[PDB]
Structure formats: structure tokens, C-alpha cells
Amino acid sequence: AFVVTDNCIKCKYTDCVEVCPVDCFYEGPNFLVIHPDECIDCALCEPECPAQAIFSEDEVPEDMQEFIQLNAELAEVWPNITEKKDPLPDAEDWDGVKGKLQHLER
Ligand code: SF4
Ligand code: F3S
């Protein structure tokens, strides 16, 4: 599985879904996650994310390890997203801001 980490939050560019061959992205109000059972680890989305939020599970930074389970959990309850949309309005402002997990919306 690949995993969406902190920097997506309040950015949510949704560039990543456009290259996903298996459509395993699931949508929250201000964040996307990858369904780990669905992901085929093609790695195609990693270079697509402007926020550079996506990692191979085995390359998730130690300080963002919580994101792994969080992706798996939210992927069970959020709706599939398979089409790019406008990035969130103040995305440029939040890109690069750390600890955005405190802003995650269910
Ligand atoms: S690694 Fe491939 S299959 Fe998994 S989320 Fe990214 S694009 Fe989709
Ligand atoms: S900001 Fe999030 S919505 Fe996709 S293109 Fe990056 S993981």
C-alpha cells in the first residue's frame, strides 16, 4: 500500500486520483486516503502529489506513522473519489505547514 500523510490536509489537490489505475482513493472534506487492500502499489501517484504527501507504506516518516492505520480506517467509511477536482481554496497557504493532523475533518 501507499499512504497519504499530513501535508494533504487542507491542500487536497486530488492530482493523485487521476493516475490511479484501481481507483483506491477515498474522500474526506479536507483530506484523501488510500485503501490499503485495493492499492496495487504501482507507485504512480507518489510523483503526482504537489504536496508530496504520498509515501510507500514502508517509507512513511517515523513522525507520520499514524497515517498508515488512519488511511486504512478512513478508507472504510469515506466515499470513493475517482476524478480530479479543484484544490481546496487556500491550499497554497497550507502546503508545507506541519502538524495539520489537528485540522483533519471527518
Ligand atoms: S500506488 Fe497505484 S494503486 Fe496505489 S493509490 Fe497510488 S496510484 Fe493507486
Ligand atoms: S494533496 Fe492529497 S488529494 Fe492527492 S494530489 Fe496530494 S494526496
Take atom 6 of ligand 2 and give the residue whose Cα is closest.
49
Q: Can you spell out the DSSP letters for 8-55? A: GTTT----HHHH-TT--EEEETTEEEE-TTT------SGGG-TT--EE
Are the C-beta atoms of residues 22 and 31 closer than 8 Å to each other?
Answer: no
List the determination method: X-ray
- Domains of the chain and CATH, by start: 1-106 (3.30.70.20)
Looking at all shown ligands, the one closest to residue 42's CA atom is 1
> Residue 64 is placed in which grid cell?
507520520
Ligand 1 pocket test: pick from 40, 48, 56, 82 the residue with the most ligand atoms within 8 Å of its Cβ.
Answer: 40
Q: Is 16 in the pocket of ligand 2 (CB under 6 A)?
A: yes
Please report the resolution in angstroms.
1.4
Q: Is 14 in the pocket of ligand 2 (CB under 6 A)?
A: yes
Report the alpha-carbon distance of residue 39 to residue 73 in Å, rounded: 14
Which helix or strand (DSSP H or E) is residue 75 part of? none
